[PDB]
Symmetry: D2
Subunit: 208 residues, 4 copies
């Protein structure tokens, strides 16, 4: 068994992206006889697609779990659907702002996550980790990779399972926000890392 | 040096109140040569006043830090002011619902917290703990005790410092909320307990 | 030219549904040489499908604009995508609660709205009406009808344009909410009705 | 009978302040045998105090209702208390940023609004206008004037009634916010103006 976990670099002014640590922290660990690979993707259209495709092609994971930062969200959110579209509210890390454009022309309008999202959520609740199902991963880079991953799956037959998980800001990221007159929700890094491992575990239990 | 920390029992349907554990967890510990006392107050008008008065009178703390649950708040909030009024949106744990009534007739309309609130907040930020200054502790039991405590201070000369701190829901309390179609902010119990100790420490450093 | 506008009856305990009045208010009016038909759909799975199919089949509209109540949303929201799924958080008006089930088995995972959503939004802004693009209409009845409508469109060739618009609570609906300790956003009925007419107009300008 | 209504000029980057129109719109009108005076105050510490004091001294109102913009609030909010403190998160329109400073040294920590706030709220509800009681008017200019007004009242014996009312953004102000990736609540200008007249009316009915 091989599992691929990806995270994203900082973006939109944020100095950190909790998903970057998550990916690095999970890279190389083993859960049962399953080997986990952690890779950090750039918040850049195009380049991110290349890194993703090469990684999937090089590792050929059975399961692919992509994690991203969802500023403002109060709990762990498991994405149910990836849509074939890009409409960036802000530019990516290269300065490009793509608006109303398909990710893969002619490809399906959308793909359902193949991760056992309800069991993952239920398992997190048992661990006392707030989590829910999101029906939109935005139309920025998180959705971008989530879509490409599921498309690769429907196209090449692997990974067997692919999905996306969004995590809230970690506490320390809230500090400089307070000054700007507003305090968004946060979740400790430990609970976030824990949530992803749980997701991997439930995914492994399910996959075959 | 003697420090008094209070918490509240569950209320409003909640099965737990993180401040109850905090009080019990801090009871009996020593921070430097300072003895900390932890007491859980009932979410009941009148009865809560008696317990508070007796405790203050029995222990005669130099510092009094009262902690409560603020459902919906996303970070640690340090109260700046206690108002001489009661206007309960819901009844207390005894079924009574007091509306537009003074706490202490003839007493001052309000009292400023005597805790070094700005330093406490600043110290929490350094620890990476989101925190801010709240200018209203509500008009329920949190405000009730905060007011009575500061009134006891202005009246008897002790404690020298008195204030109130509100904490968010802890993660596990969010689980059953998700079903009811809504996910409020939360903060891990560990960070909450930590925040209170920090507050105590900064208070001790300040007090004399 | 024929335009079909639908609304929903009250649901989830709400005594009113602003979209019901909207539909009734727009029924029978003419915008240019375009005849508008307003119909109120029941917040009931299955039954709602029948009413929708019959209405579309009987009127055979060139444009179909379905409106619904989105409790909590602060401005007019134009839906970008309808997904082939049902996962009701609450039961419908008949007491049934469908979870994780497709709307049309074997049908596409999702459909993009064919209404000129960006122009509609832009036109509303010019009128000073807050509006934005929503990328998820929920998985309750709004999404249900939005999907069925676009599926009917891809299947029968009509209507040429189909989409969904969610409106906030109208002010009067907020009154009894205040007691329950919370005040959600609202938008006056007049602005809501106005927004829908604008949408119809932009749709007509676009359609051919 | 004489009633004084004040509003504020634009501030914090906002190009408009709905309270400015409200004041101008109500200036000179008569409600029964009561003469209403509408004055716009500058969002400037010090200068605002002078304008307020001169106005109160020149008109010597029986009732003083001060209105302000509360960005983000979803309904009409009637302030219950004014605190003797300034802690500006942002500078005023002259560039000054006052932090942790009393408004009137030696004066009471706080003043309760003398307007019949509960009746005003109840009357607005009957009109279908969402409204609630706020227990904090912030520590910026709204609180500043609210305090000074009630202090003038306790000091000079007039006005007999003084209070503050905060209104949400009006719809048009939300338009350019949408771009910045966020849509706060709003309330039509008409409902806002209406709410203030109601407040004046209830105040008149009450005052003597």
């Amino acid at each position: 068994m091989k599992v691929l976990v990806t995270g994203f670099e900082p973006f939109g002014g944020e100095k950190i992206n909790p998903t970057e640590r998550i990916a690095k922290d999970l890279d190389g660990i083993k859960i049962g006889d399953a080997q986990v690979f952690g890779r950090v993707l750039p918040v850049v259209f195009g380049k991110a697609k290349e890194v993703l495709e090469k990684t999937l092609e090089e590792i050929k994971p059975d399961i692919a779990i992509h994690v991203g930062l969802a500023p403002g969200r109060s709990a762990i959110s498991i994405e149910r659907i990836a849509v074939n579209a890009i409409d960036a509210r802000i530019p990516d890390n290269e300065g490009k702002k793509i608006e109303d454009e398909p990710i893969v022309p002619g490809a399906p309008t959308a793909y359902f996550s193949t991760l056992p999202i309800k069991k993952i959520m239920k398992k997190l609740h048992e661990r006392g980790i707030p989590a829910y199902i999101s029906n939109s991963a935005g139309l920025y880079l998180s959705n971008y990779v989530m879509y490409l991953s599921l498309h690769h799956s429907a196209t090449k037959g692997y990974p067997k399972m692919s999905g996306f998980i969004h995590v809230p800001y970690i506490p320390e990221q809230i500090i400089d926000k307070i000054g700007k007159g507003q305090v968004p929700p946060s979740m400790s890094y430990e609970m976030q890392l824990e949530a992803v491992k749980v997701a991997i575990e439930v995914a492994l239990e399910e996959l075959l």
